[PDB]
């Protein structure tokens, strides 16, 4: 009985991202999984890390330090409820899928804000308690990314460099840091210029992969895997 | 008679980041440069890429495509005023300094939002204007980042990998792509754990570097620079 959270970052339900999110919901639901989706734009999710994220007395009201104050607020249970709502979803999930279009070799800012605000010290990691010792150990994560650039542009000898290069801050710096094991990324290249049949093939490839997702092992989330 | 824009992303004026920003203002002003600062948190800068970024009639009101709509709005002068205000500052600038604490191997979401929303097609890049040919060619950009991790953690074989690894999406995927020549990053490692004299040393290095910033040559912003 597996639980899945999909954190979804696209403005348009009819988009290629919307279709990938929906096929994931359909297929995981068909399998009998418990499925939850955080539709960040529809939630008008707050991306900014501010003192509003702490709802009670600050430990140093003279000089605001976001990391210190959110860590303390997590322990005291005085974080803003939008954050703790997301933490509950993550805590319960066996697998977290992130579905998003690549923006500037990274995640859209609304999703960056989810990472910044939800993955606070005490919840996602501690010092010590990170990388293999991260607090979300035992959980799986998977990035399902769409791009403007073609697969060929995203090779070692391409203009954009290899696709694994841009995965490093997300897979290693964020997910592995918090203790997740990382499943191989799903990258759907350049749907805007793909043919209708090619688009349909990309969506079907994702649905098909999800059929056996619970049999997969994570990647070795290392510099070598990313950079060779 | 050089013009500088500083895009600043910290919540707290008394922070190490705040001090680095003020030192830059003081020193560049002293030189007689024209200086502008976009204090993103103080501006409550909007990070989310949404249909509110277009003020005109949408080019396709049935299916919302952020990239297409903003490209068209740029050309028709119908982008939201917060975006066009930032574009004016960038257009006039000879150098753009980004001052920020590293969040998840990247920029804080509020600054990611500035990148997502300000650097639109038609303004910062186009077909064929990208990388060396990007539309902001002639301009210089510089990342001034502070970290939680020590320099030793940011080595090739260290836990975090080389600091150059996380710079790739920002320096190459973003700044170089838009035509910026990228000056060497200013990395102020672990100020929270540095001693008082080490902190003063890091600030002094920055102020001193700023004295001769106009004599610098851009880095070769290549995959080899970052990973080789
Ligand atoms: C701010 C910004 C920054 C960006 N930075 C980068 C970058 O650094 N690198 C990069 O490579 N790209 C970048 N891009 C491009 C971006 O990644 C792509 O535009 C995006 O991934 C396309 O996905 P989409 O869901 O929006 O496509 P869509 O435009 O929604 O989809 C394309 C087509 O697929 C169709 N479609 C939807 N569902 C189906 C279906 N089930 N079967 C058949 N077709 C279907 C749609 O109708 C549409 O015609 C950036 C874009 C923006 C706006
Ligand atoms: C959401 C989040 C994600 C993060 N992700 C990462 C990550 O992926 N990798 C990583 O390495 N770190 C990460 N960090 C840590 C973060 O990068 C550091 O905490 C930040 O860079 C510290 O900079 P600061 O300006 O906030 O330091 P501050 O705490 O504000 O300053 C440090 C000290 O220097 C002092 N100081 C200020 N001005 C001067 C001055 N003029 N001269 C002498 N001392 C001065 C201050 O008073 C303070 O005591 C993350 C933090 C958060 C909140
Ligand atoms: C790193 O390589 C990059 C960097 C930034 C990019 C893109 C690629 C990019 O491809 C892209 C885009 N593509 C689709 C164009 N037509 C097909 C709709 C649309 C908007 C937009 N805004 C920023 N970026 C955009
Ligand atoms: C990738 O390496 C990472 C990733 C995420 C990190 C950090 C490092 C990090 O150092 C850090 C942090 N440091 C100061 C805490 N102590 C030093 C007071 C505070 C908050 C916070 N939230 C996320 N992260 C934080
Ligand atoms: Zn890793
Ligand atoms: Zn480059």
UniProtKB/Swiss-Prot annotation, chains A, B:
Cofactor, how bound (note): Binds 1 zinc ion per subunit.
Binding positions for FAD per the UniProt entry: 10, 16-19, 102-105, 146-149, 154, 192, 199
Keyword field contains Transcription: no
Regulation: Inhibited by melatonin, resveratrol and 5-hydroxytryptamine.
InterPro entries, A to Z: Flavodoxin_fold, Flavoprotein-like_sf, NAD(P)H_dehydrogenase_qn
Catalytic activity: 1-(beta-D-ribofuranosyl)-1,4-dihydronicotinamide + a quinone + H(+) = beta-nicotinamide D-riboside + a quinol
EC number: 1.10.5.1
Principal location class: cytoplasm
Gene Ontology biological process terms from the UniProt entry: quinone catabolic process
Family matches, as SUPFAM superfamilies: Flavoproteins
An example Gene Ontology molecular-function term: oxidoreductase activity
Top-level lineage group: Eukaryota
Amino acids binding substrate: 125-127
A single cellular component GO annotation: cytosol
Cofactor(s) required, per the database record: Zn(2+); FAD
Modified residues (Phosphoserine): 78, 195
Residues where Zn(2+) binds: 172, 176, 221
Pfam families the UniProt entry points to: Flavodoxin_2
Quaternary assembly: Homodimer.
Primary role: The enzyme apparently serves as a quinone reductase in connection with conjugation reactions of hydroquinones involved in detoxification pathways as well as in biosynthetic processes such as the vitamin K-dependent gamma-carboxylation of glutamate residues in prothrombin synthesis.
Additional remark text: Uses dihydronicotinamide riboside (NRH) rather than NAD(P)H as an electron donor.
Family the UniProt entry places it in: Belongs to the NAD(P)H dehydrogenase (quinone) family.
Descriptive protein name: Ribosyldihydronicotinamide dehydrogenase [quinone]
Species, as recorded: Homo sapiens (Human)
Phylogenetic placement of the source organism: Eukaryota, Metazoa, Chordata, Craniata, Vertebrata
């Amino acid at each position: 009985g597996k639980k899945v959270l999909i954190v979804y970052a696209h403005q348009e339900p009819k988009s290629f991202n919307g279709s990938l999110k929906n096929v994931a919901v359909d297929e995981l639901s068909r399998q009998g999984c418990t499925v939850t989706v955080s539709d960040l734009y529809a939630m008008n999710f707050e991306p900014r890390a501010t003192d509003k994220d702490i709802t009670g007395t600050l430990s140093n009201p003279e000089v605001f330090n976001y990391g210190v104050e959110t860590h303390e607020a997590y322990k005291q249970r005085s974080l803003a409820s939008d954050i703790t709502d997301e933490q509950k979803k993550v805590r319960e999930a066996d697998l977290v899928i992130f579905q998003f279009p690549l923006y500037w070799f990274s995640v859209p800012a609304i999703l960056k804000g989810w990472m910044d605000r939800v993955l606070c010290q005490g919840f996602a990691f501690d010092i010590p308690g990170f990388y293999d010792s991260g607090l979300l150990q035992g959980k799986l994560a998977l990035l399902s990314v769409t791009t403007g650039g073609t697969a060929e542009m995203y090779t070692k000898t391409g203009v954009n460099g290899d696709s694994r290069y841009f995965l490093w801050p997300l897979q290693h710096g964020t997910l592995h840091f918090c203790g997740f094991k990382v499943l191989a990324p799903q990258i759907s290249f350049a749907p805007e210029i793909a043919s209708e049949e090619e688009r349909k093939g990309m969506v079907a490839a994702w649905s098909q992969r999800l059929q056996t997702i619970w049999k997969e092992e994570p990647i070795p989330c290392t510099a070598h895997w990313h950079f060779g």
